């Protein structure tokens, strides 16, 4: 018999169970709400509300308490013509697995077909292969565009919420293309950087009915070296803030990650990015290379300036974890940190709060 009510009741109970064991709790909550609403407003199965709300409490506790990995997203171009009618010449941006290594994934996709070769010109397609037999492949890992979730741009949400959104409910994709544009001057490798990023839209929202999903719209981008400095500084500051707070919300945590990041900040020993941005931009030669395009530098200045107190708070937590073992590390860290405070203040001509 099964009138519709008890059918969806069984369906939603199973859907919740699947989302539960499958480590995607935001949706499991989003549906347990619909259950409870229909129960207590239509059938009054208050034992149902009891155990249901119990389960939803478990859901919220899991979202915050534990932490779960981030899938790696690749982007497979099944290029050629020796392919079927549905895989022929379009990119399948496979969702992956928790810590999949591009070799492992391209290996599995070797197993998925005969003619296990690889392409090389990863940015553009291949014209000789645009109708050729002898099926062609290309595999590369890309980065998930962050969703811009509603109702979350203003509150100071904990990290867990954001990192958990950092890979799911994702629909736009991006990859990095290093283009050489500038003088090949002896030491300065950063005077030729240009990025023409890959815009990828897959019209179905991961995760879904299938892991893979074909791209729908593909667009080209462009990044100038000043704007590249912009995003590099934004990412740097965000990394520092994230490590600072993620250690501010735990106690049984290794001191290694902050030693890592602060060491990275202090001593660009092999290659020094501060003075190399300087050689590229701060000189008047760049204002002869850019007469009317300037305020990117004010953005860079204020971002490194705001890095400075976040760096200071990283040093504060470093001292909270500083010991005789960290004694020399924090010795050099304090040294170059004070030097850099005075450098930005007097040497640079920059201003900070």
């Amino acid at each position: 018999v099964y009138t519709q009510q008890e059918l969806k009741e069984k369906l939603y109970q199973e859907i919740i169970s699947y989302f539960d064991k499958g480590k995607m709790w935001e949706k499991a909550i989003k549906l347990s709400k619909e259950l409870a609403e229909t129960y207590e407003s239509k059938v009054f199965d208050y034992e149902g509300l009891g155990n249901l709300l119990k389960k939803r409490a478990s859901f919220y506790e899991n979202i915050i308490k534990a932490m779960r990995p981030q899938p790696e997203y690749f982007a497979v171009g099944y290029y050629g013509q020796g392919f079927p009618s549905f895989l022929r010449n379009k990119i399948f941006i496979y969702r992956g697995k928790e810590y999949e290594r591009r070799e492992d994934f391209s290996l599995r996709l070797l197993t998925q077909f005969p003619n296990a070769e690889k392409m090389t010109s990863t940015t553009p397609p291949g014209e000789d292969i645009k109708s050729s037999p002898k099926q062609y492949m290309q595999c590369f890992t890309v980065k998930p565009v962050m969703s811009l979730p509603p109702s979350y741009k203003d509150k100071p949400v904990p990290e867990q919420i954001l990192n958990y959104y950092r890979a799911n409910e994702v629909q736009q994709f991006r990859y990095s293309r290093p283009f050489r544009k500038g003088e090949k001057d002896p030491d300065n490798e950063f005077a030729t950087m240009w990025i023409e990023r890959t815009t990828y839209t897959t019209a179905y929202t991961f995760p879904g009915i299938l892991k893979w999903f074909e791209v729908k719209q593909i667009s080209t981008e462009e990044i100038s070296p000043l704007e590249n400095a912009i995003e590099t500084m934004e990412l740097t500051n965000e990394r520092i803030s994230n490590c600072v707070q993620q250690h501010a919300w735990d106690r049984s945590l290794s001191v290694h990650p902050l030693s890592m990041l602060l060491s990275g900040i202090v001593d660009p020993a092999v290659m020094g990015g501060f003075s190399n941005y300087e050689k590229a931009f701060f000189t008047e030669k760049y204002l002869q290379e850019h007469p009317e395009d300037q305020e990117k530098v004010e953005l860079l200045k204020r971002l490194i300036a705001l890095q400075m107190p976040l760096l200071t708070e990283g040093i504060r937590i470093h001292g909270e974890k500083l010991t005789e073992q960290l004694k020399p590390l924090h010795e050099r860290l304090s040294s170059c940190f004070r030097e850099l405070k005075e450098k930005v203040e007097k040497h640079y001509g920059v201003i900070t709060l």
Binding site: R101, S176, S263, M271, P328, L329, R332
Partner: protein
């Protein structure tokens, strides 16, 4: 959670910097983005469970010898690095990079890497080295230094084709494991 500590030391004419900056960025061959800050760490596992890993990017400059020795204490494995198609690199290895680093920490599992593995069989670079009385150190000499140092595995990777790079870090991680 558990972490990994390991070192990469060598000259500056071989560019292990590019090798590690392209292993961490996950990037495709021939499309690496150089980055300003050193100390390329990563959040990637290969076997068993996820862990935390770093890569100490160590300068090739001679003056920076004053700052280096304090990283080695309290580590897990070390990745001593050399090149096969650079003789000056081998000279520096036999002079400084093998002896002194092995001297500070003679008590830890060790691994060895072979760089520019595609110019070890490239005829043009080999020709230009012969004209410059320069030798591509072949695998048996690597084996000789390996059994002299006793590394858990002498490995050889690359950056133009990434051949076995992931294999190198796989072995390096599984050294303690």
């Amino acid at each position: 959670m558990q972490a990994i500590k390991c070192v990469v030391v060598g000259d500056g004419a071989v560019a292990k910097t590019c090798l590690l900056i392209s292993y961490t960025t996950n990037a495709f061959p021939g499309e690496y983005i150089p980055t300003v800050f050193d100390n390329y760490s990563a959040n990637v596992m290969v076997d068993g469970k996820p862990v935390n890993l770093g890569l100490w990017d160590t300068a090739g400059q001679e003056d920076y010898d004053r700052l280096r020795p304090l990283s080695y204490p309290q580590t897990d494995v070390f990745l001593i690095c050399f090149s096969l198609v650079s003789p000056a690199s081998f000279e520096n290895v036999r002079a400084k990079w093998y002896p002194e680093v092995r001297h500070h920490c003679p008590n830890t599992p060790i691994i060895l890497v072979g760089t520019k593995l595609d110019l070890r069989d490239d005829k043009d670079t080999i020709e230009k080295l012969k004209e410059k009385k320069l030798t591509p150190i072949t695998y048996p000499q690597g084996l000789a230094m390996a059994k002299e140092i006793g590394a858990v595995k002498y490995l050889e990777c690359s950056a133009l084709t990434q051949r076995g790079l992931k294999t190198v870090f796989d072995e390096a991680i599984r050294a303690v494991l």
